[PDB]
User: What shape does this take?
Amino acid sequence: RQLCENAGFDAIEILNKLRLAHSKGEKWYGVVFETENIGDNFAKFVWEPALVKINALNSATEATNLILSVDETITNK
Amino acid sequence: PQNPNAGLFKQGYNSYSNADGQIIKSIAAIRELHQMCLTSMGPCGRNKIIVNHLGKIIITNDAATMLRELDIVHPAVKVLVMATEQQKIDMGDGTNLVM
Amino acid sequence: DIRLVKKVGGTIDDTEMIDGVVLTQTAIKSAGGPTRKEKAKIGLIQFQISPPKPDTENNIIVNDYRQMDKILKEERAYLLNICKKIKKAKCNVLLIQKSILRDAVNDLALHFLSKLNIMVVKDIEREEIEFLSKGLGCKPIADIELFTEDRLDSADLVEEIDSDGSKIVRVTGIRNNNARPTVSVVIRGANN
Amino acid sequence: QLFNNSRSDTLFLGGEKISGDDIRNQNVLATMAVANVVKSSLGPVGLDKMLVDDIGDFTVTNDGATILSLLDVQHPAGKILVELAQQQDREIGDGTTSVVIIASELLKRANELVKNKIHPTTIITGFRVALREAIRFINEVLSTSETLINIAKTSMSSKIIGADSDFFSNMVVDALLAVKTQNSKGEIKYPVKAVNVLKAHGKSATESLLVPGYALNCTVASQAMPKRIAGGNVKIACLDLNLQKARMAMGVQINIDDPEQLEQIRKREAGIVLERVKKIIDAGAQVVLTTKGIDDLCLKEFVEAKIMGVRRCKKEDLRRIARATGATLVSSMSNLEGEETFESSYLGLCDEVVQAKFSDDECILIKGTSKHSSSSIILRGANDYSLDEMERSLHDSLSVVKRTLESGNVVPGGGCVEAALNIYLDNFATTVGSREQLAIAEFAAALLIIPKTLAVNAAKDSSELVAKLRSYHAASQMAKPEDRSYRNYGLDLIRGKIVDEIHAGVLEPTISKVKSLKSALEACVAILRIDTMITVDPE
Ligand SMILES: Nc1ncnc2c1ncn2[C@@H]1O[C@H](COP(=O)(O)OP(=O)(O)O)[C@@H](O)[C@H]1O
Ligand code: BEF
Ligand code: BEF
Ligand SMILES: [Mg+2]
Ligand SMILES: [Mg+2]
Assistant: This one.
């Protein structure tokens, strides 16, 4: 939704036509910037290592779960 | 109008007599930090984010650590604080139950 | 000549083209309770209905006790004659221009006007005369000795509403030849 | 949220400008600021606030508009919701807190569609659609109606007198039902504040005694006058002109030239009054109520004649005593001929005129009016902060009863008017389609704020009730013609379970929900249309 909003695409008409086409078109369908539409990123060659996405999510949650745990902020002078 | 003095033997103090600063004013000043770690006890308890005297952030579930990282005035409050520091050095656990 | 009046409350929805005239002021109601006059004829006043003084520096000096009670006698009378000459031309609505000059319409004259069931609307800007003259098929009236059935209006209904708790003055249905044509539109809206 | 930089091209004075995204956000933040203060105060399980003058002097209340009135609001798009909050209290009387919280979530959600990508014109068209459909749905889910005792009691809970709701229920209903009046040749409306409310700090809350007449907050001007007059057919003179000695009319001056006229002219300044006093006494007047003054000169005339006579009383009060006892207000009496006469038929007939001592304060009661029923409520309680609010809590509760009597329609409140609209509109969302869909969709779910916070305020979990409430309302859209038998609606918060709010007796007036949303929209619409603010510093 952000890669779209950044590039100035139709953010909702891409996600809506992506979610539908991800249940029938399998995993590797993503944003192909080169035509302003949906596509398979294996053949589009959009490739990134395993660690990035797993370490991304494992950290993003560590943050989210740490903040919700806080119920009191005390700050000294 | 205008009020007189009681007794001047000292340099400028304050005295909390009749057990007042103890029977009421102390209990309620303790209740302020009693309600604090009341919501930090056990697995459902919440962590508290404490920014110290030097701006370094510290987040803890512990009562003793969370109390060690605060600057405290009330003397009778300080009493139960050293008591949470007692069970920190002498058992490690139970610091939240001391309080 | 297109009259757009504002009153806060409601929704832009509640805007309406009035089939006649909208007015800014309200029925005086200080004395009596005339507010909604049916089958009405509208008079329009330039003059003051007071116990008035001439444009020159004047003062009633009193010598006798017997001068006093007779001064109020003519005072009460003078105000009644004006109110009588009005009912005599046969109008049940009064419209009076700005009294910044001196007199206005007296509180003693107002009870005369009330019990005589003539419905009164005071304080009307001088700019408003040109429009009101055409909008209410009613020739403007400067002196009493020139107040005539001739120069009265003949409108179907005049009734002050209560919108948001704040009133407006309606003149719906206007009989006569509209040689001059005039519209009036009431604008409502939720926020100023 | 870094403080923005003033442009290097444009040149504006004592004024800066924030554009596009910076403003849209600032509007929503300030709108939530105003709304979030008064979310705590919503529902039967809702509470009250303490608002310090700064001098320590304070007021405690729930009535949203009075809380909002009191808070010093600084932002335009805050004061707009406050301007609506009161526009409520002048067109319905109750619901002031609700209308503000609705408008806020309508903005908030609307923005989160723009803060996505959706254009504001799309959403504003998508709010227009929903509202046209919601009001059409409300009228098809209204119930035209005993019932007044509920509508009163629903506006009791959430405020202080809700604990003694049943009493201040039948108070409100009878008080109003006894001032019926026709205007404009047939309009049968119940006067917007004709029930004169007084509050005196004493006794119990239950011992607040309704007056079967009218409550005047005045005393018998002279202490030698009778502080009571009783028995059938009592005559009351409703006056407006003052009974004192005049300065020479107006443009009148005095040139004494014959010394003997000093006393002649001076004595006659008494006469005119004493003559007008006589024309009042001799009319058969037993009790006098004058808006303007009474001279000590004209009191000694009432005293000796045993005429209980008041001075300096509110003309607002006197006209509602004119319309009730039979009397006619006397601005000044001059006949067909110039003569100043006062016919006996001018007076009002009643039962009693008794000055009654309440908690260190006496006041006159006009008991048992003859020309038409009249009702007044004298509140009693702990202190002034106590009384103040239960008067404001009455003005809210007398109001909802008025609008029931003015409009033949009630809505099953308890947040089931809202909850039902959630799923109806959400299902209506497909009928249009496109991008305009998310708009109505956000609106349908932006109505969740009423039923949500009601149950938040109970401290316990919300979602348990909230989502399980939706299912029951989702059980009316899949419900067949005959199979109705599935249709039910409502919410309870003390026991905390879904209940039939028509059988339970939870009732808000018809308009109270129409003029509630109608306004709430033209609020967030105006704010959503805002894309640039230009603030210019004082003269
Ligand atoms: N006993 C009750 N049970 C369930 N809901 C109630 C009850 N009483 C009132 N309500 C709901 O709460 C709302 C009352 O709001 P309130 O907090 O009094 O402020 P306002 O009326 O100004 O919005 C009504 O809309 C009604 O739906
Ligand atoms: F508060 Be403990 F020592 F887990
Ligand atoms: F909080 Be309200 F105006 F019933
Ligand atoms: Mg432990
Ligand atoms: Mg209420």
